[PDB]
Amino acid sequence: GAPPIMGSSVYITVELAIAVLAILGNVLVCWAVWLNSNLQNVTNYFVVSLAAADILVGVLAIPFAITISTGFCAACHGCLFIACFVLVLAQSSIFSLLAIAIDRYIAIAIPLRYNGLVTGTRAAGIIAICWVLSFAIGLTPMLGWNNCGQPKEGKAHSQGCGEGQVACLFEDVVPMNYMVYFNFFACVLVPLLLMLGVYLRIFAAARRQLADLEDNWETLNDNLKVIEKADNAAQVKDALTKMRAAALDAQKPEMKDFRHGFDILVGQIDDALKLANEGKVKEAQAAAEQLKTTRNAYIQKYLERARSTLQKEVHAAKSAAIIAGLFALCWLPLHIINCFTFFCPDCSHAPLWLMYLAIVLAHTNSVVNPFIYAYRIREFRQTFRKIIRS
Ligand SMILES: CC(C)CCC[C@@H](C)[C@H]1CC[C@H]2[C@@H]3CC=C4C[C@@H](O)CC[C@]4(C)[C@H]3CC[C@]12C
Ligand SMILES: CC(C)CCC[C@@H](C)[C@H]1CC[C@H]2[C@@H]3CC=C4C[C@@H](O)CC[C@]4(C)[C@H]3CC[C@]12C
Ligand SMILES: CC(C)CCC[C@@H](C)[C@H]1CC[C@H]2[C@@H]3CC=C4C[C@@H](O)CC[C@]4(C)[C@H]3CC[C@]12C
Ligand SMILES: CC(C)CCC[C@@H](C)[C@H]1CC[C@H]2[C@@H]3CC=C4C[C@@H](O)CC[C@]4(C)[C@H]3CC[C@]12C
Ligand SMILES: CCCCCCCC/C=C/CCCCCCCC(=O)OC[C@H](O)CO
Ligand SMILES: CCCCCCCC/C=C\CCCCCCCC(=O)OC[C@H](O)CO
Ligand SMILES: Nc1nc(NCCc2ccc(O)cc2)nc2nc(-c3ccco3)nn12
Ligand SMILES: CCCCCCCC/C=C/CCCCCCCC(=O)O
Ligand SMILES: CCCCCCCC/C=C/CCCCCCCC(=O)O
Ligand SMILES: CCCCCCCC/C=C/CCCCCCCC(=O)O
Ligand SMILES: CCCCCCCC/C=C/CCCCCCCC(=O)O
Ligand SMILES: CCCCCCCC/C=C\CCCCCCCC(=O)O
Ligand SMILES: CCCCCCCC/C=C\CCCCCCCC(=O)O
Ligand SMILES: CCCCCCCC/C=C\CCCCCCCC(=O)O
Ligand SMILES: CCCCCCCC/C=C\CCCCCCCC(=O)O
Ligand SMILES: CCCCCCCC/C=C\CCCCCCCC(=O)O
Ligand SMILES: CCCCCCCC/C=C\CCCCCCCC(=O)O
Ligand SMILES: CCCCCCCC/C=C\CCCCCCCC(=O)O
Ligand SMILES: CCCCCCCC/C=C\CCCCCCCC(=O)O
Ligand SMILES: CCCCCCCC/C=C\CCCCCCCC(=O)O
Ligand code: NA
Structure with missing residues (x-):
């Protein structure tokens, strides 16, 4: 001894x-x-x-x-x-x-x-x-x-x-029943599992929002191609109808330029829709080609900024989650030993x-x-x- x-x-x-x-x-x-x-x-x-x-x-x-x-x-x-x-x-x-x-x-x-x-x-x-x-x-x-x-x-x-x-x-x-049932199970483990569930929801919401941004973008570019190879006013009309809904959907100093960007984009979709509804396919297709100027000068910048903002939130949430995980890693051994002491009185004490x-x-x-x-x-x-x- x-x-x-x-x-x-x-x-x-x-x-x-x-x-x-x-x-x-x-x-x-x-x-x-x-x-x-x-x-x-x-x-x-x-x-x-x-x-x-x-x-x-x-x-x-x-x-x-x-x-x-x-x-x-x-x-x-x-x-x-x-x-x-x-x-x-x-x-x-x-x-x-x-x-x-x-x-x-x-x-x-x-x-x-x-x-x-x-x-x-x-x-x-x-x-x-x-x-x-x-x-x-x-x-x-x-x-x-x-x-x-x-x-x-x-x-x-x-x-x-x-x-x-x-x-x-x-x-x-x-008392060890306080330490295990009240302190550990109720007051530590349950909040840590709640945190885990909240972080899962954060990362899922981020993944879904980045997928939506990419989807709206691809829908914009696919429907431009639909319009380019349409062969009547009605097909142009249907593709522009969708583009208009998506642009409004996506519309929900840099804020002035991006609001100006979407204003132009909706306006240009509207110009092309009026021409289409007058049965002027060629004029409607040429009007829709003007959308490429707006897409390059404004919409792409909005997409990149929105993506980069979400990627910073993912990075920040991972940092906070690392801290929560390290709290769990440093405290769990002690709680787990208390569980052995309490639940296994036939086991030698740690x-x-x-x-x-x-x-x-x-x-x-x-x-x-x-x-x-x-x-x-x-x-x-x-x-x-x-x-x-x-
Ligand atoms: C990453 C590093 C810092 C982790 C360090 C772990 C060290 C400190 C741990 C791991 C193994 C442990 C040892 C394992 C067994 C014994 C025998 C016991 O009769 C005296 C304590 C002693 C000697 C422990 C002291 C603490 C110990 C050395
Ligand atoms: C605000 C901060 C700086 C004040 C800290 C005060 C601390 C050190 C005081 C407050 C209550 C005190 C305890 C109250 C009663 C007892 C029982 C006695 O038989 C031994 C000391 C002991 C266990 C004291 C230790 C010192 C103690 C814990
Ligand atoms: C949170 C992560 C890192 C897991 C850590 C697990 C540690 C705490 C586990 C793994 C193996 C466990 C030990 C396995 C066997 C015994 C012998 C028993 O007579 C007393 C408890 C004791 C000594 C356990 C204490 C808790 C223990 C050391
Ligand atoms: C999500 C995870 C980390 C939750 C923590 C799991 C805890 C509650 C688990 C992990 C290992 C488990 C222990 C493994 C083995 C024994 C020995 C048995 O004779 C009594 C129960 C006891 C002591 C278990 C109690 C509960 C226990 C400590
Ligand atoms: C953020 C990073 C973590 C911060 C870390 C803070 C400091 C922890 C270091 C301790 C080592 C000190 C030296 C310990 C050497 C002891 C070896 C020994 O002889 O053990 C005797 C035995 O325990 C008798 O029973
Ligand atoms: C024998 C003795 C039995 C004792 C049993 C005790 C039960 C504990 C209840 C109340 C303690 C309240 C402690 C005061 C907490 C201070 C909170 C605080 O200072 O918060 C700062 C705030 O952030 C500023 O914005
Ligand atoms: N079980 C326990 N023991 C101690 N200290 C005493 C360690 C010990 C245990 C047995 C013994 O015979 C002599 C000493 N501090 C402790 N702190 C905690 C704790 C704090 C939060 C969760 O568990 N559990 N805990
Ligand atoms: C995802 C779930 C994470 C963990 C939550 C559930 C934790 C439940 C742990 C239960 C351990 C209960 C041990 C009972 C041992 C009885 C010992 C005996 O009867 O002799
Ligand atoms: C994350 C969970 C990991 C689980 C690890 C495996 C745990 C299952 C082990 C049970 C061990 C039971 C040992 C009890 C021995 C003493 C029995 C007695 O004599 O009363
Ligand atoms: C995730 C961690 C997995 C670690 C390995 C898991 C295996 C644990 C095995 C436990 C065996 C316990 C044996 C106890 C024998 C006691 C004898 C008796 O009570 O009669
Ligand atoms: C993350 C969870 C890890 C928890 C530890 C897993 C290992 C569980 C093993 C427990 C073995 C207990 C051995 C029993 C020792 C005494 C046997 C007896 O006297 O009956
Ligand atoms: C950057 C360095 C800052 C200061 C670091 C100090 C690190 C050492 C801290 C504590 C050592 C105290 C040693 C006292 C031994 C007492 C043991 C006993 O009372 O039995
Ligand atoms: C303060 C954080 C929120 C607290 C929520 C608590 C919800 C209850 C959850 C776990 C309690 C564990 C109960 C185990 C009971 C077994 C008692 C026994 O059989 O002796
Ligand atoms: C969600 C985190 C933990 C889950 C909350 C509920 C606590 C775990 C569920 C059941 C544990 C009950 C343990 C008691 C079994 C009998 C105890 C005994 O015989 O000593
Ligand atoms: C995005 C990579 C940029 C590199 C520099 C990092 C700049 C800031 C990044 C993330 C901020 C993290 C905020 C996390 C909150 C911590 C709260 C906590 O858990 O204690
Ligand atoms: C000197 C006697 C009082 C000691 C109380 C100590 C409590 C813990 C110490 C500091 C925590 C409060 C510090 C908050 C300062 C920063 C606030 C802020 O960042 O806006
Ligand atoms: C036992 C004596 C000392 C006990 C102190 C315990 C109370 C701690 C109180 C305050 C520390 C919290 C400081 C929080 C600052 C965040 C608020 C804010 O930034 O607006
Ligand atoms: C009881 C143990 C519970 C500890 C809670 C710790 C906090 C949870 C931390 C991380 C869980 C998230 C894992 C999923 C990663 C997805 C990342 C991504 O989409 O890039
Ligand atoms: C970060 C690392 C996480 C690892 C978790 C698992 C650690 C525990 C693993 C193995 C320990 C198993 C010890 C089994 C002891 C049985 C003793 C007996 O039979 O009496
Ligand atoms: C993980 C951080 C670094 C850990 C280094 C561990 C070395 C110090 C901790 C435990 C050593 C064991 C000495 C305990 C002696 C019994 C305590 C007492 O009864 O006073
Ligand atoms: Na802490």
Whole structure:
């Protein structure tokens, strides 16, 4: 039995290293949003709430985790607070991650009502509400779902604890049925699966909208060819009728030129339709050839801009999804071990070294988001560079 202070020293040193890095990187995130107005939008207010949770992992939850690893004598309800506060921060992170996903879904599904629906003022009230809910969920053991009524009195006496005190150890005070059914299944797993469903909807909506843009374009170019090889006024008329509906369909500084572009296009379709309906096939076909000028000078530019805007939303949603996936990857090992402890009382408990490895992996999640923003989001990377240089 090696002196406990040796493995303790390794664990604590690693925790302190993670705390340092979590504070530094997430303070940098908050400083970038505060300073750069191109980063001040509703999405990034949830990003800052998430960075605040991660700063508090470094400032409070890691010092608390170091403390509870010692099994020090404590009043049981004080022990519960330092065991459960990290659950508040994890719960807050979950709400922020779900909000980021929903925000991006609203942006890609209804971009015309996004700015009217999702405002800074409503985001700050959602954030406040979510922090209150996170305290209620993470500190639910303090409302009475705890093991303080059944203290491990032999362990308390062996350590010389005083009356009313327990050896402060996570699995002695926090019930495992709370950890598995309430904290993990209800409060973590279900929101993460909801997030997964929202991201699937985002990527499907993007794929569908890019397919629609390409379809409208091909319909435009195919019907031009229909008109070119029609042999009567009625065929020209039918192809132009369709083109007119599609152009109006697609019509739903750069905005002035693209509105001007579609105005010309509808006007030119209308000129060609009138000629067709007068039975003037050749005149109608020549009028339709003028549509190629508008297609080259305006419609193609609209198509390329619309595509590039959707491709940026896909890239941005992938970045946010990577962050949600990394939260799941860093926290799942600990939840899964708790499931074994709880559901398999005939299995030997996960060994101590694995418990602490899973705890430090969960804490490491508070380090990683600044790196994802730096690597995947030019505007953050550039603001980070400017802050670090100045
Ligand atoms: C806003 C921030 C800076 C304040 C942080 C206050 C923290 C450190 C305080 C608030 C409540 C305190 C706990 C309340 C009661 C107990 C039980 C006692 O037997 C041992 C200490 C212990 C477990 C305290 C540890 C320190 C503690 C967690
Ligand atoms: C989220 C991804 C990375 C999956 C991680 C899976 C990890 C957490 C799984 C894979 C194999 C698992 C171990 C398999 C066997 C045992 C022996 C049993 O007596 C205690 C639980 C314990 C020690 C399990 C702990 C959880 C475990 C380590
Ligand atoms: C989408 C995925 C990641 C959801 C997470 C799946 C979790 C809930 C699954 C993955 C592996 C599962 C464990 C695999 C094996 C055992 C040992 C058995 O004696 C009791 C149940 C128990 C302990 C399972 C509990 C639930 C479990 C931890
Ligand atoms: C990508 C890198 C950082 C992952 C690091 C994984 C390391 C830290 C993990 C993987 C295997 C683990 C070891 C596996 C077995 C034991 C034996 C045990 O009696 C003491 C702890 C010890 C020695 C573990 C310490 C932590 C450990 C070394
Ligand atoms: C964003 C990237 C992730 C951030 C990562 C933050 C820091 C984590 C590194 C820790 C290694 C520290 C050295 C650990 C060496 C210990 C080896 C050892 O001897 O283990 C003893 C054993 O555990 C006794 O039981
Ligand atoms: C023995 C003790 C039992 C205790 C059981 C506790 C139940 C938790 C309930 C409320 C905590 C509220 C905490 C305050 C949350 C602050 C929210 C906030 O500051 O949000 C900022 C906002 O973003 C600005 O725009
Ligand atoms: N099971 C558990 N244990 C601990 N710490 C104690 C590790 C341990 C477990 C058993 C033992 O005999 C001695 C120590 N922290 C823990 N944190 C969590 C957690 C937080 C969020 C999800 O799970 N679970 N968890
Ligand atoms: C896509 C779905 C993702 C996962 C959702 C469902 C998770 C359900 C997990 C259930 C594990 C229940 C384990 C019960 C073990 C009983 C042990 C015993 O009876 O001795
Ligand atoms: C993503 C899901 C992956 C699932 C992996 C396979 C899980 C099925 C394994 C069940 C293992 C059951 C082992 C229980 C052993 C102890 C039984 C006992 O003595 O009570
Ligand atoms: C996706 C992960 C898949 C990993 C491999 C899955 C295989 C898991 C196998 C579990 C076998 C458990 C055997 C337990 C024997 C116990 C003896 C007994 O209880 O009588
Ligand atoms: C992503 C899901 C991965 C979850 C882990 C999958 C591996 C599941 C294997 C479990 C094996 C449990 C072995 C039982 C050990 C004790 C046997 C006994 O005492 O009866
Ligand atoms: C994944 C991030 C890097 C992880 C490196 C892991 C090394 C440190 C973590 C665990 C080592 C095990 C030491 C635990 C000793 C028991 C703790 C205690 O009882 O005080
Ligand atoms: C860029 C570097 C910034 C500062 C990095 C600091 C990294 C080291 C952090 C913590 C190490 C503390 C070591 C204390 C050992 C105590 C173990 C014990 O008390 O038993
Ligand atoms: C000094 C005592 C108070 C400590 C409270 C710490 C809470 C977490 C720290 C910072 C989170 C709030 C930072 C928000 C600043 C940026 C806001 C914005 O980007 O518009
Ligand atoms: C335990 C003592 C400290 C506990 C602090 C917990 C409360 C955290 C409160 C605020 C951090 C959230 C900051 C969110 C800023 C986003 C709002 C916005 O940008 O408009
Ligand atoms: C806060 C996020 C939203 C919460 C939604 C919760 C919906 C409920 C989902 C999962 C709860 C899991 C219930 C498992 C019950 C088994 C209990 C038992 O048999 O002892
Ligand atoms: C959707 C995420 C998880 C699904 C929500 C519901 C939770 C999983 C479904 C059933 C789990 C029930 C586990 C309890 C079985 C008996 C427990 C026991 O005997 O100890
Ligand atoms: C499109 C590639 C351009 C390369 C530079 C990147 C510019 C910005 C790109 C995407 C913005 C990503 C926004 C994702 C929201 C993150 C929210 C979160 O999950 O925390
Ligand atoms: C419990 C685990 C759930 C974790 C949720 C993590 C967030 C989901 C992340 C990615 C899912 C989306 C995968 C589909 C990719 C399509 C991309 C594309 O069309 O270009
Ligand atoms: C990112 C990597 C994801 C990998 C998920 C799966 C990891 C677990 C895989 C194998 C572990 C299986 C251990 C089975 C132990 C059986 C012990 C026994 O029989 O008692
Ligand atoms: Na977090």
